[PDB]
């Protein structure tokens, strides 16, 4: 007869703006997860936290990606070389590679990526799939609406029979980076001087709201403003993960003020208790019209993004989209995000349609769904005919990826 799956020695890479997820196919979690941002000195590149977090003179901090697509190919190549050398620790010519890509990735970047992987790394086989499809596959769904709220974008992607419906995509920029900017504005309003850990030699405990008592390292080299801002944002991201909480209903200041506070201590020893402002900040994801200094009321909340994306699809598949809403991305891990989204969508979905959000609320499942789907797909024995081979590339060139990887 037949057997179940089949393991072929493949590798799965899912590269985002925030971190690079990589590992071997067949495993249920990525082997490694390190930041996508890297240092440059001029070029010489420094990758991963242990080399990135050390201060160094004239070292700029960059990203290879822009709008979810590759711009700096030298940085991307450096990241891949680092991943192959230090983390995978195996020769690249032996392992097939399945790569994740953005739903909106252009043809030219797909062709350039295929050319890079086949001609430089000399891999034996290649496949390229979109994030939403793998996110659906990780939850056992072929049809469903993927809501991915990452760092750069909050996007609703409808999926049907393992294919992205590109004309139904709705992008919004309100995501983790926007929340980081709002936290920066909050600290400026509160007159909270933010000192990253690298500047601190030692610290002493102090009271709530009192000035910090800390000593600065004397042996520091002069560092660029980009690296300093990246280090500050690393602190603000911990603040996001710790303190912020979505209001269960529409934000009322008098109700949020009565909630218990949350204590947070900064690396320099400054500490204070945070009240309603920790709930006012993430409310802009859902009701951006009340945000201060935001450019116009034209932009959409998360629920309205979902409904617009579903309404732009064919009427026959909308039950299948509302019956499987797969929430994904790290920014969805803010406390009570999913409950608020479910309530708002229940208030806006038609009563004739049943709404069902997939139970997915863990860090591993929310952040690494695309990688898990890639591992699942590469582990299928039915999939093994779908690889682009090196022979196919040498015969048909880089244009074969459009035919073979829709």
């Amino acid at each position: 007869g037949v057997y179940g799956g089949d393991e072929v020695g493949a590798l799965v890479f899912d590269i985002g703006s925030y971190t690079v997820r990589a590992g071997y196919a067949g495993e249920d979690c990525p082997k490694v997860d390190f930041p996508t941002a890297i240092g440059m000195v001029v070029p010489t590149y420094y990758i991963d936290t242990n080399a990135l977090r050390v201060p160094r003179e004239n070292m700029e901090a960059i990203s290879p990606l822009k709008n979810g697509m590759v711009e700096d190919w030298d940085s991307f190549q450096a990241i891949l070389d680092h991943t192959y050398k230090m983390h995978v620790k195996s020769e690249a010519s032996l392992h097939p590679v399945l790569m994740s890509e953005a739903p909106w990735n252009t043809r030219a970047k797909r062709e350039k990526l295929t050319e890079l992987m086949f001609e430089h790394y000399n891999i034996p086989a290649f496949f390229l799939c979109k994030t939403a499809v793998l996110t659906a596959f990780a939850n056992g769904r072929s049809t469903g609406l993927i809501l991915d709220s990452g760092a750069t974008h909050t996007t609703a992607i409808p999926v049907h029979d393992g294919y992205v419906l590109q004309q139904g995509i709705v992008k919004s920029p309100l995501a983790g980076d926007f929340i980081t900017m709002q936290c920066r504005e909050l600290f400026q309003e509160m007159n909270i001087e933010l000192v990253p850990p690298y500047m601190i030699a030692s610290k002493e405990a102090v009271r709530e709201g009192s000035p910090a008592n800390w000593k600065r390292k004397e042996k520091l080299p002069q560092v660029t403003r980009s690296w300093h801002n990246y280090m500050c944002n690393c602190v603000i991201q911990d603040f996001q993960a710790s303190v912020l909480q979505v209001s269960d209903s529409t934000y009322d200041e008098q109700v949020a003020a009565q909630m218990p506070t949350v204590h947070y201590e900064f690396p320099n020893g400054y500490n204070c208790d945070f009240g309603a402002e920790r709930l006012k900040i993430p409310e802009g994801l859902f009701d951006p019209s009340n945000v201060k200094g935001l450019s116009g009321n034209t932009m959409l909340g998360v629920s309205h993004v979902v409904t617009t994306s579903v309404g732009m699809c064919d009427i026959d598949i909308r039950p299948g989209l509302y019956g499987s809403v797969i929430v994904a991305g790290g920014n969805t891990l803010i406390q009570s995000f999913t409950d608020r989204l479910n309530r708002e969508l229940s208030q806006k979905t038609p009563p004739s349609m049943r709404l069902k959000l997939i139970a997915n609320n863990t860090t591993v499942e929310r952040r690494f769904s695309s990688w898990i789907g890639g591992s699942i797909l590469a582990s299928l024995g039915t999939f093994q005919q779908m690889w682009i081979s090196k022979q196919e590339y040498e015969e048909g060139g880089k244009q074969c990826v459009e035919r073979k990887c829709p």
Partner: protein, 53 residues
Amino acid sequence: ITLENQVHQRIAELRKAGLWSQRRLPKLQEAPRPKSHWDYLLEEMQWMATDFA
């Protein structure tokens, strides 16, 4: 009891406007198709996803 004819009348208006959901049209049957490669791939995907979880 007097509003029964009114209830019938308003339902007739909705039916004429196409808003009466109980009078939905049925789905035309397209040509049957044997399952293709991609359908079996999706079934195996479901099975493997359950195994992973």
